[PDB]
Design a protein around this ligand. Structure first.
Ligand SMILES: CCCCCCCC/C=C\CCCCCCCC(=O)OC[C@H](COP(=O)(O)OCCN)OC(=O)CCCCCCC/C=C\CCCCCCCC
Ligand SMILES: CCCCCCCC/C=C\CCCCCCCC(=O)OC[C@H](COP(=O)(O)OCCN)OC(=O)CCCCCCC/C=C\CCCCCCCC
Ligand SMILES: CCCCCCCC/C=C\CCCCCCCC(=O)OC[C@H](COP(=O)(O)OCCN)OC(=O)CCCCCCC/C=C\CCCCCCCC
Lengths: 315, 309, 316, 309, 315, 316
């Protein structure tokens, strides 16, 4: 909807990377449910610990259901949990990332404040009074007066609280911590997705063989998906660290109109504090035109000129 | 379509129960088309070792199919389709009273005039104790209300249709419950098959297990519970219908609460719609009661004359 | 839509937790329908009720394919625990119960009509320029403000007499918390039954020849993981419901005081509402205090007197 | 597109029956592509034990496929496709009236003018028997409506198209009922297959069972029943509505009720389209009759002049 | 949207036929992926060139994977390419037909011209001046004057070019050529969809038998779908040839208002040329009422009457 | 929506080719997931690295079903070329890259804001009655035209400084053409490895007993057909992108001249815009010159002088 002005370019990049990660998670989960299995053949030479390598085919005298049981047991026991539960962990991480990125859009206080800010900015951007000031009917004058009063009420309501900036900082910190944990544990457990796995499950009382040599058909495809997910996680973490550095390099709780007041015709716009400053910084990251046009309603000289024009068209 | 005003709480409960029953029937049919099969083994004549039946794989498949279509009872394999038919019938009956074009036009006109009267400031002005355009709109709405009263009160189509709908629902519930209670314990996991195929395989008697038997039984129990709740709601609806005679509506309470007592007695389908609205919300009924008063007509005429003169 | 003002942060969190639990239930049900099976092999050496465990060569059981299928089906339907077979269906039923308890007061007309009327009136009062003028006009604005004042007075004299919405919300919270208690009892008690290897003694020796079979459940670990995740989600849901009930029972929600508003504003004659109106105002304050502060103007008699004075001024 | 006004109740019922038939055909095709197969076993020559046919599994699959192609009749395997084609044909015959642009323009113009010919307050005023500006605005509407009346009173395209469509529907129903009723008992669960592949498997005569045999029979019975209901509705419609020609709709009951008795006798496709709305809602027909009366048009102009005195 | 007035009945018929062809292509492709395979039994009597005809079952001593390999090889080598690739060819033909039918709706020059023509036709159809003339506020009069000026600008802009008529003619020519190629190659290659195929793939070193007797399961259904598609292509080609005959029977680049100027009192409407004439011919194919209403704005006498009525209501 | 004026014929053709290649990638990926296997049979007579070929009766390999499945899996993983296995994944990645390079300037805010501002202003100027009047009044229309003139001047002096949109479009075109070059190299070079029959020597002799197997790839011919179709579509895409690059490099798109418009119209004082404005006007010219001719009214000073004269005339 109208929240797209609050999302900077890095937020859009993170959202698209999360969409691609969700697609990867869905594809991997579909593969896991559908065609993930093992194909195990018993090893008749067990001189060493693992399978020993030493024309007619070898006869194992095993039924089809004995093979199915061996596959199920060696898939349950002697297969690493990462290869079995890679897409589920990826899906959980994507859900966590989407919840953290869109947490302030569903928390009622911050969502209400952001909706009010977006509505007020949209009202001010389409106001002809701003266009006239940067460069007349009495109904337009009273509409501008009402919008100025609403802007004053919003300023005296929002400048007290500082919960939007705190919530955004907490979301960024949680996202970067989750990225660090993912980049550690996924990379450390990515070499265990092997195509050929040797299992020793001790089912000799049911089959007659001790060790089996299973093949994991989706091991290489899962390794490729894991590499792609690691690359996406690296990009996501780089973007999140860029956002954290952008927040921590300058005090975003204080916003100034110095360049704006030098460019514009008013040199009396005061510096704002707390969530208003952070929202104005986000709007600057989106487009400086919106903040440049919105700076008109924050100046007392603009109100004086507005009421002077109201008196002029009145008489 | 903003038809929830005409639907009372029991109608909403019946709609939600019908949706849940439809979901259950669809899930059961999907299971029936997904993994409904029987596994049959021949009854062989009288260190452990397995018994060799000397039957090929396709002979086993033939035995399974033959016993599925002969030994398995009809209620153990056609229950989801019958449940789907019952849910479709109940959904059609629920939506029948506002789908016939005459009744649909009548209820649409009723909803339109009720929305006009609810949002009309003239009702608020009458309840509290203007403008020429507001007076003209009020006169037009009064004329529309009079035309609707003359157009609807003569017939009794909507009330009779609703009575037929609830009677059909109650009869269908009774028949479904009676015919279903006979087939609860009859569904069993094990079965004995005598398909007379001894010339093809060599065995006369087979023992079969229906894979979708216990799950189908649990779905049957849940469906029975939900349809019992639906039947209780339908019985309460019939008790409400037969409790107060809906053929006429007495405005004694409305005329006593309001300052205008020239409110006629609305009868027939208009009275039935007013009763349904009152069971939904009494505010619209109060609006229609104060918009049916001749004292309000005299007040509107006097206000219009004062505006003109 | 416009009902988001009626959902505080705990309501939104419970809704999202219920959505995630419903997704888990759907996934588990799909797995149970499609990929749930059981692979059974007979034990030729039996020393007790359960199976006895003791170049190499394979063991031949002399069993056909459909004999194996029969053994699998019988040991799956007979000697598999009921919690393993019916876990996702029970989870789906619990999620449906939670969603019904969340949306009952929105679907029940006796409370739904009052809630939607309150939402509409609050939205109209929050957008009224008369509130902005009073907290800091044309004749049309004045008559609209007077009509809205009369509507607010009628709504107050119509809704404050009844407390059905507060009772229904309390009943929903009680049902949700006791359902959470029952779930966190029975699911935790029956969480050990989801094991991999199960021994069955289904007594089909007259058909196959073997007495005891050892069966592997391929979806045992995934169902156990889903059960653990659902237990954690239900724990969070129960903690949020406990907090909601503690907030409801900490102070009387059927008596709202405008003391902060009448101290902040010049109007010191705002009446104290009760029953459903006080509870709805408390919910709005938990959502955002600006709406409650803006709506408090329509209750003070001083604001009504000023509106009447302005109407008289623009009337002549 | 607000075409429900054009559609009478029997057309809506036939459309819903066609939708149900299309759903049944899609379900039958899904089952045909899902688990429709035949299982065949050879008829071997003359302490029970299994009979070893000495056949590989691929030989069994080849026998099943060959007997599916040869032994199984065409109507037992290609029924859902024919049902789908028939449902599509019926739906197109029910929808071709507005698909064709030449008829679509006339239909859209009629609906557009019909919207104003009844919603106007002058319609209500004439029904009972407001400003002169409204009369001046309605003068252009009257001129346009009379231009349309002159334009469509010499064209018979819409009525001819509708009659052709419903005749096609009736003929299709007759053909479908005849061939389906002919092909009922031929479908059987068991079949005797002689595929003449003795050089490939060694057996000459096989016995086969069709997996989706009883279910397809039940779906065929359901389709026959729905076809019978659809045909009965269509035949009643042709016996009452279209047995009296609809090209003329000279207002007789309306001119009896209305004070403005001199209503023009519009004919052809305009009269047929008015008959459709009459079979949809008689209130629309009444307001049209009181509005489109030539004496009522002259009275509208006269009343505008009277207010403009 | 509003483009449906530009499509005559034959264009809508081609669209519906292409939709049905696309449904056939989807059905055939689903069958090809799901059920399409081969089932082959070797012939132990190969006295003749093909399989030769020569109780207890016949034992071939073949495993299951040998049977699967024989099926795959005889599905690859000795099965006709038309039976294997029928739905893909149908899908490609539907893509070509849909691209040719909707090319001018997406080509930016012709799309812009058609959108401008549709907008001007909508303006002229709802204009009260046409209703007044064929049988008044000053704002309506000045709007009618502005619409007259825009109609004159449209006439002096579009009549110079000839891109729309050329593009439509090229689309029709390509469609009929593609129909001719389809009707040739599909019919010439429809006899090779046989149920039973006698294959000889020379895999005796892997299986032991030279010739096999395979049976294509979906051969009858594919033949039925091919016959249905041939009938649909025949209808499509008949429609396209009717369209080509309609285009080439008379100069669509010249349009005459003789009947319209004799019907109304304005007898000074000049003949339009090139894309204007072609679009008006398309409108006449759809509905002559739109062109009858639009011909008012192309007459100087109507403009003179409009300004005369403007002066009349002015004074 | 309104952005269709910013997409010339080459952009529409590339979008449609991208959609076709995306659906080809989806179909190939579905086939790769579902049906892609490798039916392998051992060769008893081996004389080289590959398999050797040398009433009739069938050959008995003495291999179980799972031995055959293991041979299939190992020879599919090891001795099958990666291009045959991972063709649709590469196609999907390339289509996603092409779609990103096509929609990057629409999704990047620094150019999205400029593009939406230009589209809105151009649509308001195309629907402006003042353009119709000038190419051949109400006070409200006059003041709206003056406000739109001021808005056009502000947008021109704000967007004419930077050239981010033209630079981004040029970068996207360069990335797309070099991507096409790499694709048409590596796909053409690696298309010969998609063969039906492949001989494998995976060395599983200790598990099965045979050294070399011969495998049939059932989807090899269909993947080869899809690869040929994708190569043809990539060739068409590259030719279109090469034409786009040649059009961009033939004349400077940061210099727009109204010489034709000032020759046709009376206004012969229309200034030459530059940077993003000139590039967007060139895109409009490639779409339709009517929009540019209509917008040229708001840039001439004579039109503004006439508008000032009319405003003075209707002011008194
Ligand atoms: C934060 C999220 C996850 C952190 C995981 C940290 C794991 C540390 C290492 C622990 C370890 O070695 O194993 C943990 C443990 C071992 O499991 P099994 O292999 O089944 O156990 C043996 C069975 N015979 O790992 C796991 O369970 C994998 C994690 C699964 C989490 C799934 C969560 C999502 C589930 C469902 C949602 C989608 C439907
Ligand atoms: C409880 C809520 C309601 C649940 C309702 C579920 C309805 C399910 C209905 C129909 C399912 C029909 C499936 C197809 C027909 C049956 C085919 C069949 O028998 O397949 C069995 C077979 C079982 O595995 P095997 O091949 O035997 O190999 C493993 C052996 N241990 O099935 C398969 O292999 C294919 C499975 C296909 C279904 C896959 C479903 C995947 C679901 C979810 C994936 C993850 C999604 C994540 C979404 C995240 C969104 C944020
Ligand atoms: C990178 C791209 C990724 C694309 C998405 C990939 C994941 C897709 C998600 C789920 C699908 C999972 C598999 C299918 C579900 C059921 C489980 C299963 O195993 O099914 C197998 C089963 C096949 O059984 P077999 O016995 O192996 O068949 C004979 C082999 N000789 O699958 C199926 O029947 C379905 C396979 C096809 C699915 C649909 C493919 C597309 C359809 C038509 C293509 C042609 C027309 C295209 C028209 C396009 C118009 C715009």
């Amino acid at each position: 909807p109208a929240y797209r002005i609050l999302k900077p370019w890095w937020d859009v990049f993170t959202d698209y990377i999360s969409i691609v990660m969700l697609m990867i998670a869905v594809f991997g989960g579909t593969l896991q449910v559908t065609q993930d299995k093992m194909i195990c053949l018993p090893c008749k030479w067990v001189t060493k610990d693992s399978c020993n390598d030493s024309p007619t085919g070898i006869k194992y005298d095993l039924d089809r259901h004995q093979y199915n049981y061996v596959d199920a047991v060696c898939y349950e026991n002697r297969l690493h949990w990462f290869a079995k539960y890679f897409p589920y962990l990826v899906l959980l991480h994507t859900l966590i990332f989407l919840a953290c990125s869109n947490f302030w859009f569903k928390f009622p206080r911050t969502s209400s404040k952001l909706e009010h800010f977006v509505s007020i900015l949209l009202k001010c951007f389409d106001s002809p009074w701003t266009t006239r000031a940067l460069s007349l009917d009495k109904k337009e004058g009273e509409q501008a007066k009402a919008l100025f009063e609403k802007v004053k009420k919003f300023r005296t309501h929002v400048e007290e609280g500082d919960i939007v900036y705190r919530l955004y900082m907490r979301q960024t910190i949680i996202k970067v911590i989750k990225f660090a944990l993912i980049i550690c544990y996924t990379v450390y457990y990515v070499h265990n997705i092997k195509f050929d796995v040797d299992c020793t499950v001790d089912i000799e009382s049911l089959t007659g063989y001790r060790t089996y040599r299973c093949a994991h058909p989706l091991a290489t495809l899962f390794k490729i998906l894991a590499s792609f997910y690691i690359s996406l996680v690296i990009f996501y973490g780089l973007i999140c660290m860029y956002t954290l550095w952008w927040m921590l390099r300058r005090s975003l709780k204080k916003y100034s109109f110095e360049s704006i007041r030098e460019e514009s015709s008013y040199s009396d716009i005061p510096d704002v504090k707390n969530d208003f400053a952070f929202m104005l910084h986000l709007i600057d990251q989106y487009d400086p035109l919106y903040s440049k046009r919105f700076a008109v309603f924050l100046s007392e000289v603009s109100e004086n000129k507005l009421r002077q024009l109201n008196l002029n068209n009145e008489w | 379509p903003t038809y929830r005003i005409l639907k009372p709480w029991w109608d909403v409960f019946m709609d939600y129960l019908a949706v849940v029953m439809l979901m259950v029937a669809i899930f059961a049919g999907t299971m029936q088309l997904t993994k409904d099969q029987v596994v049959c083994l021949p009854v062989l004549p009288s260190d452990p070792t397995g018994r060799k039946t000397n039957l090929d794989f396709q002979q086993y498949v033939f035995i399974n199919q033959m016993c599925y279509h002969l030994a398995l009872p009809w209620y153990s394999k056609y229950f989801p389709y019958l449940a789907l038919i019952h849910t479709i019938i109940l959904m059609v009956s629920s939506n029948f009273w506002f789908k016939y074009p005459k009744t649909c036009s009548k209820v649409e006109h009723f909803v339109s005039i009720l929305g006009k009267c609810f949002e009309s400031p003239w009702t608020t002005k009458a309840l509290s104790e203007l403008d020429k355009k507001d007076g003209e709109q009020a006169k037009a709405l009064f004329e529309k209300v009079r035309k609707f009263r003359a157009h609807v009160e003569d017939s009794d189509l909507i009330y009779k249709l609703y009575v037929v709908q609830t009677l059909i629902k109650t009869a269908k519930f009774i028949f479904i419950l009676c015919y279903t209670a006979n087939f609860v314990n009859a569904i069993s996991f094990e079965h004995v098959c005598k398909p007379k195929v001894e010339h093809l395989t060599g065995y006369e008697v087979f023992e079969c297990t229906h894979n979708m038997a216990y799950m189908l039984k649990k779905l049957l129990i849940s469906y029975i519970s939900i349809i019992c709740v639906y039947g209780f709601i339908c019985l309460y609806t019939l008790f409400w219908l037969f409790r107060i005679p809906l053929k006429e509506y007495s405005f004694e309470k409305v005329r006593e609460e309001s300052s205008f007592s020239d409110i006629p007695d609305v009868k027939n389908d208009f009275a039935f719609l007013l009763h349904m609205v009152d069971q939904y919300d009494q505010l619209y009924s109060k609006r229609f009661g104060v918009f049916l008063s001749e004292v309000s007509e005299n007040k509107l005429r006097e206000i219009s004359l004062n505006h003109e003169w």
